[PDB]
Amino acid sequence: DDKAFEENRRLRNLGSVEYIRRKNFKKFQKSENTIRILISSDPHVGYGEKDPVRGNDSFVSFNEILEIARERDVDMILLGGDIFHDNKPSRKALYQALRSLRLNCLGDKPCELELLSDTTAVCNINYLDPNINVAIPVFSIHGNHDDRYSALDILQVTGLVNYFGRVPENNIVVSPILLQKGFTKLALYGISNVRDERLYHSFRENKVKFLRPDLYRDEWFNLLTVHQNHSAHTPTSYLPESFIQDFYDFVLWGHEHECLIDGSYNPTQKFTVVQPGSTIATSLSPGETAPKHCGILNITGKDFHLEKIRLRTVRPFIMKDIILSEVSSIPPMVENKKEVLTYLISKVEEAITEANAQWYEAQGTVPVVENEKPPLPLIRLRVDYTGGYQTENPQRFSNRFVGRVANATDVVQFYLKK
Amino acid sequence: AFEENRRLRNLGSVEYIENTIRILISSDPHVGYGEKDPVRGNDSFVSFNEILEIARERDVDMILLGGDIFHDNKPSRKALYQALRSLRLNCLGDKPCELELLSAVCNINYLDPNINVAIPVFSIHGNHDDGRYSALDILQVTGLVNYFGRVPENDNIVVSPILLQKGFTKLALYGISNVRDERLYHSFRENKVKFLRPDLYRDEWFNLLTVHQNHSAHTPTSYLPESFIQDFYDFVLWGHEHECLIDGSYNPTQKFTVVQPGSTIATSLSPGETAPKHCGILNITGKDFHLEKIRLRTVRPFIMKDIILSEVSSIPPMVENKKEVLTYLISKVEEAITEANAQWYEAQGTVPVVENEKPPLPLIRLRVDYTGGYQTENPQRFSNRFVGRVANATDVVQFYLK
Numbered sequence: 079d080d081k082a083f084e085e086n087r088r089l090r091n092l093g094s095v096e097y098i099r100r101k102n103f104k105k106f107q108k109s110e111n112t113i114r115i116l117i118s119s120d121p122h123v124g125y126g127e128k129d130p131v132r133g134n135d136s137f138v139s140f141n142e143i144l145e146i147a148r149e150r151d152v153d154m155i156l157l158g159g160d161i162f163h164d165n166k167p168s169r170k171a172l173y174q175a176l177r178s179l180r181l182n183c184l185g186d187k188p189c190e191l192e193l194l195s196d197t198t199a200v201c202n203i204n205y206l207d208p209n210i211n212v213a214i215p216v217f218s219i220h221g222n223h224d225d226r227y228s229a230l231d232i233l234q235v236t237g238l239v240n241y242f243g244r245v246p247e248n249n250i251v252v253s254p255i256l257l258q259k260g261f262t263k264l265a266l267y268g269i270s271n272v273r274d275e276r277l278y279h280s281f282r283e284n285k286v287k288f289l290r291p292d293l294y295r296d297e298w299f300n301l302l303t304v305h306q307n308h309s310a311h312t313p314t315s316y317l318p319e320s321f322i323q324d325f326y327d328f329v330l331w332g333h334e335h336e337c338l339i340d341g342s343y344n345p346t347q348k349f350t351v352v353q354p355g356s357t358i359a360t361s362l363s364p365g366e367t368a369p370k371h372c373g374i375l376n377i378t379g380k381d382f383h384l385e386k387i388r389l390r391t392v393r394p395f396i397m398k399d400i401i402l403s404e405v406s407s408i409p410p411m412v413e414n415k416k417e418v419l420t421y422l423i424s425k426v427e428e429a430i431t432e433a434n435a436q437w438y439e440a441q442g443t444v445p446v447v448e449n450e451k452p453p454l455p456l457i458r459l460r461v462d463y464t465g466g467y468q469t470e471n472p473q474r475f476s477n478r479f480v481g482r483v484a485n486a487t488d489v490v491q492f493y494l495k496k
Numbered sequence: 497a498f499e500e501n502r503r504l505r506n507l508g509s510v511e512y513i514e515n516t517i518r519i520l521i522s523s524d525p526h527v528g529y530g531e532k533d534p535v536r537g538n539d540s541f542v543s544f545n546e547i548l549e550i551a552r553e554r555d556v557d558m559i560l561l562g563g564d565i566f567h568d569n570k571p572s573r574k575a576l577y578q579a580l581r582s583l584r585l586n587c588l589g590d591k592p593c594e595l596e597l598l599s600a601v602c603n604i605n606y607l608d609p610n611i612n613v614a615i616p617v618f619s620i621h622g623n624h625d626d627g628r629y630s631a632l633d634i635l636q637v638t639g640l641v642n643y644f645g646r647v648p649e650n651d652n653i654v655v656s657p658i659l660l661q662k663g664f665t666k667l668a669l670y671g672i673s674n675v676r677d678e679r680l681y682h683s684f685r686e687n688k689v690k691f692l693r694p695d696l697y698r699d700e701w702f703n704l705l706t707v708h709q710n711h712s713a714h715t716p717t718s719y720l721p722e723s724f725i726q727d728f729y730d731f732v733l734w735g736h737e738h739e740c741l742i743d744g745s746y747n748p749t750q751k752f753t754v755v756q757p758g759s760t761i762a763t764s765l766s767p768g769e770t771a772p773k774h775c776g777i778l779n780i781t782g783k784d785f786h787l788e789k790i791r792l793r794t795v796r797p798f799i800m801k802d803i804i805l806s807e808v809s810s811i812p813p814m815v816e817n818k819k820e821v822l823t824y825l826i827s828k829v830e831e832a833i834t835e836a837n838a839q840w841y842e843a844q845g846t847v848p849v850v851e852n853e854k855p856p857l858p859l860i861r862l863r864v865d866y867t868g869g870y871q872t873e874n875p876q877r878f879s880n881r882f883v884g885r886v887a888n889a890t891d892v893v894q895f896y897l898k
């Protein structure tokens with residue numbers, strides 16, 4: 079294992095790259111060279127649907143992303159998959175998504191993107207359908223949660239989403255969607271989610287083929303969208319950044335929920351990797367705590383600039399790691415229950431006023447009577463009680479904050495280090 | 497107390513508040529039904545597509561449906577996909593809708609400046625469609641179907657029309673989506689239904705009511721008596737009932753035509769399902785109306801035959817005759833098939849030759865009176881005999897005693 083990860087770091091450019099042969103480009107009847115793309119991932123529409131506090135988060139936040147896209151006048155929308163939480167989404171979940179897509183993505187706004195090529199008699203690229211007035215085309219790969227008929231196909235068949243980066247085998251051919259706006263040229267690629275190991279082994283077997291545009295060969299901005307583990311504990315259960323062909327200029331990394339919207343430059347492959355994160359916390363994990371963002375990717379020539387946008391509808395999430403053997407006045411190895419609880423309770427209150435502060439920061443507002451109050455926050459304390467410390471039933475502890483936290487059932491987790 | 501129903505009349509309350517409209521009518525497509533069936537798995541998608549295809553081909557103004565659009569409350573992803581696909585390929589386009597409305601995501605679809613609706617669909621929900629999101633809501637939100645005639649409470653129903661005009665003719669379209677029959681019945685008995693009629697041109701309106709209810713029952717509270725329906729109606733589209741009675745009937749006391757077009761697919765091996773399926777085109781021109789019946793071509797034929805063994809002359813009675821009844825019944829199944837196949841070629845308007853499409857496996861059912869001395873097989877054993885030849889694996893035969 080330890081050395082298998084080094085085999086991975088050294089190996090690069092796997093599989094094969096081969097080559098292949100205001101303005102309105104939409105066909106609806108009833109600057110100029112900078113492609114504007116809103117990037118997001120993992121909305122998990124439907125997630126927490128049945129929860130009396132959290133039930134509408136997924137729908138409101140998915141709607142936000144499309145709202146921002148329309149408010150900020152972008153040319154298109156690119157998503158890293160996992161649109162829906164459930165493989166067969168509830169009627170409500172499907173409805174809300176379709177509602178948000180219909181109200182935010184259709185209108186008279188000219189689509190300025192010329193489809194040079196995408197490489198059934200349903201119109202495939204939606205804004206090219208003369209019967210549908212598409213303002214802002216949505217493109218998305220499928221995630222592991224979107225796994226014959228996915229709900230993605232349903233979004234596609236209604237004409238509101240462009241499901242792309244289809245993967246039926248595991249010989250994988252990755253051909254681009256070609257878009258021109260002024261002199262700027264976007265070559266767009268996607269690999270929808272494949273079992274991480276099946277994908278790792280396909281690269282090792284050089285069974286991933288990339289098709290590149292022969293025309294304007296060096297003029298294309300190359301964007302790859304993926305839905306894969308970016309790290310793992312097994313060395314074959316994720317996708318090594320170095321495997322990805324270095325002709326790519328930009329990589330949108332879905333599947334990972336943590337918001338690392340700033341991007342990392344891969345100095346070897348010389349491309350930037352953006353992991354925008356989910357639009358909702360799907361577990362009380364450390365990775366979900368980082369404030370959720372979407373982005374606007376502006377592409378001009380083969381240069382790009384990234385604007386991060388703090389999501390305003392996400393429930394604040396604050397998680398604290400506490401090692402009780404690093405806290406006095408907690409006298410260990412004695413009946414210290416009242417002392418442990420007091421500390422932990424004070425930490426919850428602390429986290430809470432942190433969450434409210436974080437929320438108001440996202441809104442650009444202040445706690446005053448004429449402004450909207452923050453929603454109940456998610457709060458989790460992870461507590462290592464090694465060294466001689468008394469605990470409390472976690473639900474009993476959680477009930478000390480009813481009406482004060484969104485998760486009034488598991489605010490606290492007690493564990494021992496291993 | 498049935499007699500009481502025939503006596504009662506005009507229940508609930510009425511409150512006031514080219515030149516021919518062409519409507520394709522149908523009902524109970526049950527998209528999704530028999531999905532998992534290796535023979536019949538595609539029937540419901542193919543036939544539901546037929547309905548819209550015809551509409552498009554025959555260039556109607558609109559489509560009207562009487563519920564049970566989907567067989568399952570939560571349709572499979574396949575079912576919803578095919579409905580949406582058919583709806584989008586068949587109802588969208590450059591043809592203007594010449595229907596002026598006189599009544600955002602819950603508005604009339606062809607009015608939406610972002611979707612070009614060539615042929616608008618209107619539909620109520622049936623009991624197979626009925627939480628508070630229905631699959632009808634999904635079709636509505638995509639802008640592909642106009643869900644109407646919603647029933648928010650069963651104990652106080654306000655029925656309001658959609659108002660449409662083409663040239664000089666005015667259509668008042670009413671729907672009552674499915675309610676448990678007993679609930680609906682009572683609501684009529686307590687005057688808990690309220691019918692809203694337009695103040696202006698109150699009598700220029702061709703009044704059309706769409707329903708999804710039992711048209712007959714075994715108890716007198718589990719169906720919707722024709723009499724209760726306000727006599728200001730000129731036409732009633734009768735959904736829910738699967739049997740094709742496309743020619744309709746005239747209620748002389750209420751003065752309205754009832755049309756029960758039937759389902760577009762057979763969901764039981766009931767006698768009612770055997771009648772050949774049609775859709776229709778209602779040609780409204782001012783006050784009168786011309787209904788054109790249209791034979792469906794994608795529906796699997798279904799032939800049912802009733803047999804009394806004691807009346808079968810080639811079988812000897814009160815004897816070990818098992819060999820002789822099977823031979824007869826097997827010839828009866830063979831005879832039904834040939835009737836099925838001819839029925840299918842009639843629909844296509846073709847003959848059986850090698851250049852032409854040949855018929856699908858038909859549904860075949862024999863109900864067999866074996867009273868007197870006669871010898872049966874296990875029904876299942878009998879139906880296994882016809883794997884290559886009939887579409888139904890089960891219930892090919894039913895023996896009963898008089």
Ligand SMILES: [Mn+2]
Nearest residue numbers: 120160221333
């Ligand atoms: Mn995810």
Ligand SMILES: [Mn+2]
Nearest residue numbers: 160221222333
């Ligand atoms: Mn995932």
Ligand SMILES: [Mn+2]
Nearest residue numbers: 524564622736
């Ligand atoms: Mn039905």
Ligand SMILES: [Mn+2]
Nearest residue numbers: 564622623736
């Ligand atoms: Mn029904």
